[PDB]
Write a protein that binds this DNA or RNA. Structure first.
Ligand SMILES: [K+]
Ligand SMILES: [Mg+2]
Ligand SMILES: [Mg+2]
Ligand SMILES: [Mg+2]
Ligand SMILES: [Mg+2]
Ligand SMILES: [Mg+2]
Ligand SMILES: [Mg+2]
Ligand SMILES: [Mg+2]
Ligand SMILES: [Mg+2]
Ligand SMILES: [Mg+2]
Ligand code: NA
Ligand code: NA
Ligand code: NA
Lengths: 151, 178, 63, 66, 63
RNA sequence: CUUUAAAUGUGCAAACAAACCGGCCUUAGCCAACUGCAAGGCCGGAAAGAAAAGAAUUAGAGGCACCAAGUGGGCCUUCUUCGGUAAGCGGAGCAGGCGAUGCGGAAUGAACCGCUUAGGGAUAUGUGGCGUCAAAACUUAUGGGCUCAUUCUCGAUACGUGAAAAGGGUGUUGGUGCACCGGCCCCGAAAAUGGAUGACGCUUAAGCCCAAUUAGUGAUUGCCCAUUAUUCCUUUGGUAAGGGCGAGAAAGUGUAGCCCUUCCGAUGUAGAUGUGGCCUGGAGGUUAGGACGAAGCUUAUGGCGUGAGCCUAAGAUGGACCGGCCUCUAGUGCAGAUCUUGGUUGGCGUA
RNA sequence: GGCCAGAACCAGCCCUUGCAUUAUCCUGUGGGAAAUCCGGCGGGGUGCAAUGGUGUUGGCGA
């Protein structure tokens, strides 16, 4: 009915219950470099440098840092292809991303294994699958049946 | 004909976990066409009563139960079926067959004929053979009298398949066509 | 190898049954899948899954 | 005389597919970024180019001599 | 040999993917004797779904 | 309106232009300073190249351009819905269809069910069926129950085209010391040409709800029908794959295909493109025919080609011109425009 | 005349018991004559495997 910038954001841009208030000091002290992965989540209590409502859950990479602002590259599908959009936001509307955590853990674990092998220590025994079979000794046995009282 | 159901026994468990390192083992009896349907009924009962889904469970064994020698007995079948506008209904009937499987198949056909109930809406609670002095219905009680006898009337006896004919002579056994 | 594996399973099951416990079998590792419906009025998602599984005709089979 | 629908549009879009995005290492321009850092980066790049020319000259001389 | 291929497929060996990716999909004939109902699950009296080790009799009329 | 809050969704990542581990060079970029942080490079090292824990799969070649057509009235269905009393009504969301498409079924139907299409055999199926029409139980069973219906009316293939409260007959079920509560049938149930489970008919069903496959005898699939599946033969085209160089073989896009083997696809309206693809009047060349009969015309005249078409035969037709091949050229192919000109025709020996 | 038929042979293709489990089971020795039925004790039937060729004999054809 009207193509305003903030149309239909009554629930999107709204603070959670009993969690109102301006940003904290850890947010102010967080450090962002070029090439980091960040999440774009709007803060309703700042109102300066907010992103458009399209970018509220997306993840991107940092390409630019200014005194109080960040530049993020975010993918956007338009018809038959995907664009690379560049948006400028304040530093309060971004948050460091844990999307590569498992990959970095894998790399560290492999390096630790290599160090242990070179040193000569004994590696832990490998895990055993749960899809194998064996003898089952049951402590309790019951009878499964529909009774009269059930209905 | 031989009965169209079988007597199965399914034994199962929930997969052990850290919160549940020693789960309980249950035993289930069901009359089914094959063991895949037996397992399906088992897991339905387990989910509906014990809050255990098939995707976190274990089946320890499924086997088919053998039957007793052929003897004419009276069977009590305790059964329950569902239909809309009636809710769940539980009924008890006495049958007269040569095995538990036969009695239960009779019960299924009877329920289908008299109440339009189907296999996935029927549930069997208990089946047992009762002595001849515990029968409370005359239609079943009349078959264990000591002097029971009757003739065979209105017999529509046909011919062997190889000897059937289309036209035969009027007062003769001679086939004219076929 | 096949004969030995079968015999070993038989002895293990008998040993459990004599004492009154149960034996849990190893879960199946292989399945055989065949397509029983033809190519008409299929959703895009299921179409892609069948293409990835290599079942593009009726009565095609894979492991 | 004015009608709107989104009926055939997804199928049309997927006929020649949704193309994925360009890899981030391509078209990696720096125009419009923070000027104070941009200037220092330019100076360092100039020095690097001079160093590369000198290194090639040294390689050529070594190969010729031995 | 062919027994190597059979063993790998049957036991899910270390070359299961190689052996099955190097094959064309199997193209079978319709089951002689007919199906039951292609629009219902096997549990309901139809044909589709998982039928455990009863798939072998189904396939023995198609191979 | 609201904290709580799903199912279906939606963004990013998962080792070869990436990232890791210790020298060195450059820059003021930051900081009181630097050998600290930032940025761009050089040098050297490691590398289950991604283990084990359910630990992917692919009829899985990535990227980049140029030129142009048609279209811009849509409609139906499944779920979700707003307006409207409603509607074969108006407006939307997701997907599938028809349009543009036949074939096998629902007696009939754009859209329902099955299946999707080169020219043909054999075998087996899907949807639907097995009293006759009409292929199949020459009316199967050595299966269990239920039902009698007197003028539109007992039932009897979904989508879909026959109905409500209330009331009764025959078979059963809770309760107990009569009440209720379901299966089938009857009443409630009233229109205009004569008529419709498709028709006949069917009642120890050929009806309804279940269940079998030759029957308590003992392993496995009763049988009938597709433009589908499997297999065999032939054609045609490839993002094609190999071999060769007594009648036979050309170093080859396209032929009467240079020869042989092999695998995969084949429908289509508007539209695009290809073809040693067909045809008509004339020009430059080349090779030929005709008074022992050219062109034109006739056909139960056959032969060849998927086809447009080409060629021979006979004329008890004609009487002077004309064929093939390679290039060039254009006033170059007709079934329909209330098409244009000429001839004919039924009505009709009628008004 | 390979014009029409029959039989035969090669190749290919279509068709045409075993071991596991055997027990809520089998079999002797208070209730309703006997049986059906319920407690004591003793002895023990269903999931896998086993068109293409190469001649021959007649008919029609002088
Ligand atoms: K329009
Ligand atoms: Mg069928
Ligand atoms: Mg049109
Ligand atoms: Mg169709
Ligand atoms: Mg017939
Ligand atoms: Mg075509
Ligand atoms: Mg056209
Ligand atoms: Mg001219
Ligand atoms: Mg004629
Ligand atoms: Mg013209
Ligand atoms: Na248009
Ligand atoms: Na009919
Ligand atoms: Na004309």
């Amino acid at each position: 009915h009207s193509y305003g910038y903030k149309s239909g954001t009554r629930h999107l841009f709204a603070k959670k219950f009993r969690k109102h208030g301006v940003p904290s000091v850890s947010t102010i002290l967080t450090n962002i470099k070029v090439g980091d992965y960040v999440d774009v989540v709007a803060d309703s209590a700042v109102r300066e440098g907010m992103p458009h409502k399209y970018y509220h859950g997306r993840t991107g990479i940092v390409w630019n840092v200014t005194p109080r602002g960040v530049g993020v590259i975010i993918n956007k599908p338009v018809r038959t292809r995907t664009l690379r959009k560049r948006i400028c936001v304040r530093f309060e509307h971004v948050r460091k991303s844990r999307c590569q955590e498992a990959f970095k853990a894998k790399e560290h674990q492999f390096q630790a294994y290599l160090a242990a092998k070179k040193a000569g220590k004994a590696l832990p025994p490998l895990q055993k699958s749960s899809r194998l079979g064996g003898i089952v000794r049951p402590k309790n046995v019951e009878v499964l049946a529909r009774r009269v009282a059930d209905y | 004909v031989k009965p169209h159901l079988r007597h199965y026994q399914v034994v199962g468990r929930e997969s052990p976990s850290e919160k549940n390192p020693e789960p309980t083992v249950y035993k289930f009896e069901v009359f089914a066409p094959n063991f895949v349907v037996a397992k399906s009924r088992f897991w339905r009962m387990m989910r509906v009563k014990n809050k255990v889904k098939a995707t976190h469970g274990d089946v320890l064994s499924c086997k088919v139960v053998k039957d007793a020698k052929l003897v004419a007995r009276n069977y009590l079948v305790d059964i329950a079926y569902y239909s809309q506008r009636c809710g769940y209904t539980r009924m008890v009937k006495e049958f007269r067959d040569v095995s538990k499987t036969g009695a239960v198949s009779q019960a299924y056909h009877d329920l289908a004929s008299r109440h339009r109930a189907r296999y996935h809406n029927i549930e069997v609670l208990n089946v047992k053979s009762i002595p001849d002095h515990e029968v409370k219905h005359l239609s079943i009680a009349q078959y264990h009298a000591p002097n029971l006898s009757f003739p065979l009337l209105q017999r529509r006896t046909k011919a062997t398949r190889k000897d059937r004919a289309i036209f035969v002579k009027k007062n003769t056994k001679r086939a004219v066509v076929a | 190898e096949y004969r030995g594996a079968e015999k070993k399973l038989v002895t293990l099951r008998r040993q459990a049954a004599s004492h009154g416990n149960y034996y849990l079998e190893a879960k199946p590792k292989v399945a055989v899948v065949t397509r029983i419906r033809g190519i008409a009025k299929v959703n895009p998602k299921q179409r892609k899954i069948l293409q990835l599984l290599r079942l593009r005709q009726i009565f095609n089979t894979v492991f | 005389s004015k009608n709107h629908t989104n009926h055939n549009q997804s199928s049309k879009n997927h006929r020649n597919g949704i193309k994925g995005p360009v890899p981030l290492h391509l078209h990696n321009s720096k125009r419009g970024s923070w000027l104070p850092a941009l200037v220092n980066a330019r100076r360092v790049r100039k020095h690097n180019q001079k160093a590369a020319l000198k290194k090639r000259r040294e390689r050529i001389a070594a190969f010729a001599a031995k | 040999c062919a027994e190597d291929m059979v063993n790998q497929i049957y036991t899910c060996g270390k070359h299961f993917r190689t052996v099955t990716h190097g094959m064309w999909p199997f193209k079978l004939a319709p089951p002689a004797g007919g199906m039951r109902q292609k629009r219902r699950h096997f549990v309901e009296g139809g044909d589709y779904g998982n039928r455990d080790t009863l798939i072998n009799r189904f396939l023995a009329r198609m191979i």
